[PDB]
Amino acid sequence: QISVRGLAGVENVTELKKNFNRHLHFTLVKDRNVATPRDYYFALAHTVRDHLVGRWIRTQQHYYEKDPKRIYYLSLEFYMGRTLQNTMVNLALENACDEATYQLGLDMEELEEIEEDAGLGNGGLGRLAACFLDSMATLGLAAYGYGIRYEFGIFNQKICGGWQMEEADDWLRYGNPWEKARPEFTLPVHFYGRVEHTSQGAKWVDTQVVLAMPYDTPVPGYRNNVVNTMRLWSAKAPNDFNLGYIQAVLDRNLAENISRVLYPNDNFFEGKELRLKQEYFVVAATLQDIIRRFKSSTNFDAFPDKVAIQLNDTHPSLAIPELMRVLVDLERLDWDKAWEVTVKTCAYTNHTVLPEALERWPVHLLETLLPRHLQIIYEINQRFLNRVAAAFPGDVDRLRRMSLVEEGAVKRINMAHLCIAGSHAVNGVARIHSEILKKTIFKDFYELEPHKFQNKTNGITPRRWLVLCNPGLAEIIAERIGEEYISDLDQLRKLLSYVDDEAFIRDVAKVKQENKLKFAAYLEREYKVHINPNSLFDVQVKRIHEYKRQLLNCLHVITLYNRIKKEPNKFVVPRTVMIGGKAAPGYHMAKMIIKLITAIGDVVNHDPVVGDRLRVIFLENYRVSLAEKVIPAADLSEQISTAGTEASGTGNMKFMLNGALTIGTMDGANVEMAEEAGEENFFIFGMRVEDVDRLDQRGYNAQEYYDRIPELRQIIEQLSSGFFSPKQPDLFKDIVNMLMHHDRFKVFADYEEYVKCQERVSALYKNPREWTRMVIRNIATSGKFSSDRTIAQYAREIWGVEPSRQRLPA
Amino acid sequence: QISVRGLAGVENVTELKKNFNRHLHFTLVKDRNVATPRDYYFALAHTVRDHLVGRWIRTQQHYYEKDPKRIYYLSLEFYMGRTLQNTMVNLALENACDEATYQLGLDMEELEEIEEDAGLGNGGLGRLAACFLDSMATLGLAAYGYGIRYEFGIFNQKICGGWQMEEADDWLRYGNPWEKARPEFTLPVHFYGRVEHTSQGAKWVDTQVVLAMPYDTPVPGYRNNVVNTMRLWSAKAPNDFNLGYIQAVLDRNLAENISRVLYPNDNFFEGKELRLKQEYFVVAATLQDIIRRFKSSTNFDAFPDKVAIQLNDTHPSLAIPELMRVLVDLERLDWDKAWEVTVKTCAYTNHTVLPEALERWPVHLLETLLPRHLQIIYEINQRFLNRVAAAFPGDVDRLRRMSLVEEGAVKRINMAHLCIAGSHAVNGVARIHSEILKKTIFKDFYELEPHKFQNKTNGITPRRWLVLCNPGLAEIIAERIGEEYISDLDQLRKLLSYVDDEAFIRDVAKVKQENKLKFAAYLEREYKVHINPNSLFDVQVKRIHEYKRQLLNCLHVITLYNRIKKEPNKFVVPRTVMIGGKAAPGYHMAKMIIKLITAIGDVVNHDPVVGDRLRVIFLENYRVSLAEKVIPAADLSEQISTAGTEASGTGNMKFMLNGALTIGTMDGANVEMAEEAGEENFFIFGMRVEDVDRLDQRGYNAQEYYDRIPELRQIIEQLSSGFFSPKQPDLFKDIVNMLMHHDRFKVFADYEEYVKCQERVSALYKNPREWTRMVIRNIATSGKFSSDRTIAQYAREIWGVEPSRQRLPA
Numbered sequence A, B: 001q002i003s004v005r006g007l008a009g010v011e012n013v014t015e016l017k018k019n020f021n022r023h024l025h026f027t028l029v030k031d032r033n034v035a036t037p038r039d040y041y042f043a044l045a046h047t048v049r050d051h052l053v054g055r056w057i058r059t060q061q062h063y064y065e066k067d068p069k070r071i072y073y074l075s076l077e078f079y080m081g082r083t084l085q086n087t088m089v090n091l092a093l094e095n096a097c098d099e100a101t102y103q104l105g106l107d108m109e110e111l112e113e114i115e116e117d118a119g120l121g122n123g124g125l126g127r128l129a130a131c132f133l134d135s136m137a138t139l140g141l142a143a144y145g146y147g148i149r150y151e152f153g154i155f156n157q158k159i160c161g162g163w164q165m166e167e168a169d170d171w172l173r174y175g176n177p178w179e180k181a182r183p184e185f186t187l188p189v190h191f192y193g194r195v196e197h198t199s200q201g202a203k204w205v206d207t208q209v210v211l212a213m214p215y216d217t218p219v220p221g222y223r224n225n226v227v228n229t230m231r232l233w234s235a236k237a238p239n240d241f242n243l244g245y246i247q248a249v250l251d252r253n254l255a256e257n258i259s260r261v262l263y264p265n266d267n268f269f270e271g272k273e274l275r276l277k278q279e280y281f282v283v284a285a286t287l288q289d290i291i292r293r294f295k296s297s298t299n300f301d302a303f304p305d306k307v308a309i310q311l312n313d314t315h316p317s318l319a320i321p322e323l324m325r326v327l328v329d330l331e332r333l334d335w336d337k338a339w340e341v342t343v344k345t346c347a348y349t350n351h352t353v354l355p356e357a358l359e360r361w362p363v364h365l366l367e368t369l370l371p372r373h374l375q376i377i378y379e380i381n382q383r384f385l386n387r388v389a390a391a392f393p394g395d396v397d398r399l400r401r402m403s404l405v406e407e408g409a410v411k412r413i414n415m416a417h418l419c420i421a422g423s424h425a426v427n428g429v430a431r432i433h434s435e436i437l438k439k440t441i442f443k444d445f446y447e448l449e450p451h452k453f454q455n456k457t458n459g460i461t462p463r464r465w466l467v468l469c470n471p472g473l474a475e476i477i478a479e480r481i482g483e484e485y486i487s488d489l490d491q492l493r494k495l496l497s498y499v500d501d502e503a504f505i506r507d508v509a510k511v512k513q514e515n516k517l518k519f520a521a522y523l524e525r526e527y528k529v530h531i532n533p534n535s536l537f538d539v540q541v542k543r544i545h546e547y548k549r550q551l552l553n554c555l556h557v558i559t560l561y562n563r564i565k566k567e568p569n570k571f572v573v574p575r576t577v578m579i580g581g582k583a584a585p586g587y588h589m590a591k592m593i594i595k596l597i598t599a600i601g602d603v604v605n606h607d608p609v610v611g612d613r614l615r616v617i618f619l620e621n622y623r624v625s626l627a628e629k630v631i632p633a634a635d636l637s638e639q640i641s642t643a644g645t646e647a648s649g650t651g652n653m654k655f656m657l658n659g660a661l662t663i664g665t666m667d668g669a670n671v672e673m674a675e676e677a678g679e680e681n682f683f684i685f686g687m688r689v690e691d692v693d694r695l696d697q698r699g700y701n702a703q704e705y706y707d708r709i710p711e712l713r714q715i716i717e718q719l720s721s722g723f724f725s726p727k728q729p730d731l732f733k734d735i736v737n738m739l740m741h742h743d744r745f746k747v748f749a750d751y752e753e754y755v756k757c758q759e760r761v762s763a764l765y766k767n768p769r770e771w772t773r774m775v776i777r778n779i780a781t782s783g784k785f786s787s788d789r790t791i792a793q794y795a796r797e798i799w800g801v802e803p804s805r806q807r808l809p810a
């Protein structure tokens, strides 16, 4: 049908059809008379999988022969989504499979919808890891993703009575055709025990053993025949475990619970023992695997030349003392040499400056669970603080500020401080964020070792986030400038010479309209909700958090409703306001925000005076597969975090690439986005970081805004009196109290400028031609935000390896 | 190599080789340079599996078209062993695969040894179910095996310091290529709750739900292209289960524990709640599946014409009140009609008369777990006792004896009484056993309904138990009388005309010697134990139980040792005494018996005066795969249970078929075996059932034997004084005390006759030619003990269906 989806040539189509029928028969043990759509999905998945393995085996043998430096990306989250379409796109099989299935009498899009998301992440940090794996394979790097194979990923969100309900994400119920279990490469992981000092060093003894069994998933590069590996560990009890009899067997569950479920906290640290076990489990198993592979190439001087370990946040921070443990206790290297190797091997990426999100583990937990590691951490700290003391003599407060050990009621280890001390590179994820790190929370460390601190602005993969989710747009772009932009997104700049092209303007606006119609149809079919496809699609999708200010969006929605009710017969640009995202099960305020959004919808959507001019919909169960649907459909992207709180954002980049305009604060990557497109082509509003600082020094008084803004006062009075909850009048008292008395994120302070800016958006939407021209200027300048650019920078500036676009033999 | 293993013809060998390489590459994701023997096993297993599926799909579609009466064999145990060789034998693929692997540079026997046993059973009852499935498929019956897919089967037995140690049988660690998960056919099972009475009947409400997910395993018939199904249920928690958050997800384990582990009790009832849940789980899921399949052929009058349910012991006895529940509560049939259908559908097989083995469930357990079923059981009992009262007016003690409800400290339900009341047929498993049932424990029931009581003498499959485990013997037999005996074992009678054939005598003795050499080599390679292959191989392999009298065997061994030590320079027929079998983890006496056996070995095997004349070896980890090795190697089969205790035995039949002579009591199937071969050709000794009864009436006094038999006195004095345990002199005090004061099984009473009989065995072994001629007379008359005969009798006399040897189209 379309050119970007590859060739459907006779030979391939015939061969795909026969392999489909073979899998249906031999693999699924079904015939055409009893097969369901799910059986057909699996037959297709197995057929596409076959095409991977040949390339998978030869990529890994290529790395063995050439022995390049290996990159190990350690993460507790890999937010992968669906794999089928991504695999077809990267292998140039999409049109052939589309033809093959059509000839078998099947609709491939229907089959694609049967696949479960691999929801092994919470949001931005987890999705970044997935985009990174794609880019590393596309750039021909010898890279491995290492994590945990959670039996249950992020919970499925149901909305009941306007409230969030959680249910288990049993994503493995029907099997996972993409993974290959590798029980032969099972490795032991140790917990608890005690430290014994002998004549020849320390020994960690009397430990409890949990086995780590790896499952490998292929990661295909974009049309380069490279297939890398994501290896995820699963926890297994040893066979002599607790070995009355029946109980001992049932107790195996305790060990295997380590890999059972993903902790659903986003930007919030929960100091639970099971989480700590997960963190060590991934680290201990991964490092043994790394060292094994290194020895199979004695002398650890070459270790940093052959190995890079990237820590995704502090979650795998125990890699630092674990590497020290192995080098010192097991390989018998002296401390100083081991430390040199460790530092040159490890690099750390920070993803947030929110204090409640920083990992600070109680010493008493580490003492019991990992007694040798605590000893190593203390020694690291002592030696590090001796360096600080020598650099800044007599600065006693600096010593306490920089210590890895935090004193107080309970002593804690600051894992971020551990990561900086033990890494040769520390990076933030957007220019403003990296500057904030150097100026505020890691200022002391920057002053000691300025060379360590870098920026690596985040990106997204244009494969999943353009070609896959928006084939209509990818096609009209390819018609003008060719296909090379898919692996060289900077080429999109060539589209600036089409900004006054009447044909292109019409096509861009046409693709958006089609996307909006398709998404409007999805909402009817799957959720029985009705929307006007002619309205402005105003969307905010991301995890529910106070810093992200879904509440500010809510206030605007209510302002629009109140203005309509005041002047009903006055014309307003029709809007469909869509808000979606999950709240952590124990985050009360976030759960209340979801209830507020649905409650506003219940009033607004059923007011006869409003008509089809304003609709408020809560998008249930937001996840990767849903993002691929709503993002191509959006007109307006809401990126309205309080300045200085969103480290980067990546959802922002997805919207820009897909033809939505952005309303946003000068926060995270929004700054660089506006810089690339031009500020005239972005809807920037609100306080800058400097303005937030000024307000904090003076003291934030929300009552001031309430007193001086009558439209804001009305909303607060409506919320308090029970306008949006007539049966439970005080339902939202907690929300009002927070807004009025303890709002960390200064919702009221940005309200006026936000509403004003939204008026300017509505004004531009009234002029379809000029709206679209601004859109083209956004898409054309979105090149910098490809994760291929990001990964190229990591490769050159941190890992010390060169990317390659050269094909491997097929 | 040998004719019975099929054709290895060019076309097939080439096609097997290419499919092997395809699986190694695409299925296992390996190349020849990294592949291990295990990878090669799996590639072969997948290759052979492919040949099953075509026949599997067409068998099941054949049953749909023809709509025959279906046979449902319900069992908590299916002791399957290994599947690869059995599949090759039944599909006539053994020689072709042997050739194909040889040409790939692989040894197939080495590959076969990598497969884990499917150890989903304890012993005889579990193995019977497996032989039965094989015979039902071979006889073309529309039969289904239904059970539980235990994550852990019977424990692996390690011997440490002479003591049994248990370890988890993690049989699924590397995967199971034979099974196919069927998550689409998942069914709900209900537990707990309460009973609600409405205007329109009873309702079972507020229940906890556990999901039952089926896994299907193919069961191939012997060269008839029939492939039946064994469906095993796995427990799964529902997704809203307990749905703080993390705990709710981890608590899913509680529901899924239902299918976690096989209870390791053999001939002993343990009234544990988890066991009861397992029993209902299998029954509830199975019956829904049965009814679904029946409706997809409204009127339940035809139900017994289209369905037979065979209960393997009382373990699935809840099928009776569950069928009533479904028919009465859900289908709204009147009681009397539902009862007629239930009785005509169900049949019950009893496997033991030992009182401690009978299932008697506490009413309070059933009240809480299955409140509706208890109500139905009470109603069944009331109506049944009204029939008894009408047949035997005024016989009040009969009423209490026959009641399904047993009064006492705790009220219990007698599950055996439930089974008789609710079944149209009740059978024992050997002629003597079935007679004992009618004369003793079920006398009252036999008097009420004589027509219900039948005998079905047990059998073994000659596929696994001759062709597979003893190809050498199968070949020499085939040379003379052809191949038809494999599915018509009665043809072995034709071998009687070769009893004076000098060529045949030499060949029979040659096959045995080769088997003994091969097994002697296995013991060195895998356990580093040394044995004399020229000695008489005296073997007792079976679960360790007091009734089986491994202790009587021990006493003989010690008698032989004492006689040698008394007259060292006197000639004795050299023996290798081998004893193996597992003890239930909480069966103290059985564990002590294992320790005694190893302790005797420690003294006997290292006495320089004994030399190579006497060896005592404990066979570690006895299981199906080990049985296939030791049985073809045996000269003497020990079947020495106290008369009236071994319902049938099946190990006895395996030895007879494989060229061992039998020393045994007139118990179980030994009686029919001796009848078939002639008593002159069996070594029968000891009390008959009548003699045991006489001794019980008089009172068994063990001291009498101790006082009058000096050789027995010496042994007891040796045991007591610490001769066999010098460091722990009183180690065996419990054994001695039991033997002297509370021996339920009268070990001493059979000692004299046993030792005398053993002398006659040794005498015959001195004459190789006459030993072998007696062997030929045994093998030649073993025909009756094919499970094909047994299943034919079930089919004709209980299920009301005709067996068929006709091939299905390939």
Ligand SMILES: O=c1ccn([C@@H]2O[C@H](CO)[C@@H](O)[C@H](O)[C@H]2O)c(=O)[nH]1
Binding pocket: A122, A123, A124, A125, A126, A128, A265, A266, A267, A268, A351, A352, A357, A429, A458, A646, A647, A648, A649, A650, A668
């Ligand atoms: O716990 C956390 C901490 C940070 N981030 C996000 O990481 C993304 C990738 O770097 C950033 O784009 C985003 O600003 C940040 O909140 C998370 O998603 N979870």
Ligand SMILES: O=c1ccn([C@@H]2O[C@H](CO)[C@@H](O)[C@H](O)[C@H]2O)c(=O)[nH]1
Binding pocket: B122, B123, B124, B125, B126, B128, B265, B266, B267, B268, B351, B352, B357, B429, B458, B646, B647, B648, B649, B650, B668
């Ligand atoms: O709990 C039990 C009860 C009986 N049997 C055995 O069943 C076999 C098959 O019918 C018989 O051959 C054997 O005599 C009996 O002990 C068991 O193996 N377990």
